[PDB]
């Protein structure tokens, strides 16, 4: 069966995620919380510019409209 966005995405919460931003920076962390616009909340947040680690950021809100894609991590 087709795996659809909200299900798939909901399915992601609790687990490590890699959210890539429109602007190129991407953010690795634990996907705490999610909502109706797909605003996102990460934890143990690491930040990568150009793929290069730049900083550690802890708990973080990601405004939904900055998101290019999100994915799984193991």
């Amino acid at each position: 069966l087709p795996l659809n966005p909200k299900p798939f995405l909901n399915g992601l919460t609790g687990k490590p995620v890699m959210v890539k931003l429109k602007w190129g920076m991407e953010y690795k962390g634990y996907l705490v919380s999610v909502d109706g616009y797909m605003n996102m909340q990460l934890a143990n947040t690491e930040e990568y510019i150009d793929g290069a680690l730049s900083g550690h950021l802890g708990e973080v809100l990601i405004r939904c409209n900055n998101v290019l894609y999100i994915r799984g991590v193991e």
Partner: protein
């Protein structure tokens, strides 16, 4: 909008709209908000300093500050009014380029220098005003505070037209810090520097809206 709609509306569906209705179902089913409790560390943000408070006795009175912030405005009002007149006159005065830090430093304090005449300042554009303040901050970092400087800073400020660039906001802060710091060295109230330092702090904090830096007594 934050998520706009681009597309319209137990066995596989044969038509798209029937698919999307079907999907709209399965996700409406789904819990909009979800929260995943977790169990088991941070990087540092080099936020700059503020301004060093005055030693007991030296911090100036709100009434005075307030008076300085008021009068300055009149200056700046007058400075504006007659800009055009002083724009056109200039016998010696090889005004350095906006690029020439070292030449703009010697120009103002010299190695003695030119004071800030309206004839001289009124020609200087906003970008130069900015730059010149900067160099004069840089000459301050590395040397004793002089009244030539005080008048020069003061004057550069009077010409500084707001709304300020965030660049110019930041520069006048870095400046005022140095003032507040250079203030800690003083041994007696009768020091020349004291009031000058206090003014330059004052005008920045109160006139230029950089209130976090201000001297509260």
């Amino acid at each position: 909008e934050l998520m706009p709609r681009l597309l319209p509306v137990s066995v596989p569906p044969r038509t798209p709209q029937e698919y999307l209705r079907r999907v709209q179902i399965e996700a409406a089913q789904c819990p909009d908000v979800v929260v995943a409790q977790i169990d088991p560390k941070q990087s540092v943000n080099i936020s700059l300093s503020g301004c060093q408070p005055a030693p007991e006795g030296y911090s100036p009175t709100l009434q005075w500050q307030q008076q300085q912030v008021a009068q300055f405005s009149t200056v700046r009002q007058n400075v504006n009014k007659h800009r055009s007149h002083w724009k056109s006159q200039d016998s010696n005065v090889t005004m350095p380029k906006s690029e020439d830090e070292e030449g703009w430093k010697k120009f103002c304090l010299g190695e003695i220098g030119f004071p800030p005449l309206l004839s001289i300042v009124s020609r200087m554009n906003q970008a130069t005003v900015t730059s010149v303040l900067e160099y004069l901050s840089n000459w301050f970092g590395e040397r004793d505070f002089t009244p030539e400087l005080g008048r020069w800073l003061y004057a550069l400020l009077a010409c500084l037209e707001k709304p300020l660039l965030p660049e110019a906001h930041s520069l006048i802060r870095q400046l005022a810090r140095r003032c507040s710091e250079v203030r800690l060295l003083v041994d007696s109230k009768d020091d020349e520097r004291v009031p000058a330092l206090n003014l330059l702090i004052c005008l920045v904090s109160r006139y230029f809206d950089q209130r976090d830096l201000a001297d509260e007594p």
